[PDB]
Amino acid sequence: VEVLADHPGELVRTDSPNFLCSVLPTHWRSNKTLPIAFKVVALGDVPDGTLVTVMAGNDENYSAELRNATAAMKNQVARFNDLRFVGRSGRGKSFTLTITVFTNPPQVATYHRAIKITVDGPREPRR
Numbered sequence: 001v002e003v004l005a006d007h008p009g010e011l012v013r014t015d016s017p018n019f020l021c022s023v024l025p026t027h028w029r030s031n032k033t034l035p036i037a038f039k040v041v042a043l044g045d046v047p048d049g050t051l052v053t054v055m056a057g058n059d060e061n062y063s064a065e066l067r068n069a070t071a072a073m074k075n076q077v078a079r080f081n082d083l084r085f086v087g088r089s090g091r092g093k094s095f096t097l098t099i100t101v102f103t104n105p106p107q108v109a110t111y112h113r114a115i116k117i118t119v120d121g122p123r124e125p126r127r
Contacts, residue, residue: 066084
């Protein structure tokens, strides 16, 4: 529907009223080492070249380990390429995500909720 294309949009509510994530990773779809990449939108003062870092480990566990999680904000937006997504998937565990940027007006952005990622149908299910 071309009418519901540009008119609507998708963002994640974060603790900071200036930092918003364009994609809604409330879910995930990785058959294997196939992660998803999102961009961060910031309405704060930060058009210079800074750094955005993100993690996704459970509070009772280490912080998840992502690759290329330190992208340089170009303007008010950043993006992750080789983003590797390998955080623990314990469903009974609380999943915690935290994003911090140290430019001129340090914006804090975190997201904490359960994770909806499960094995899709690789070749291991054969046993």
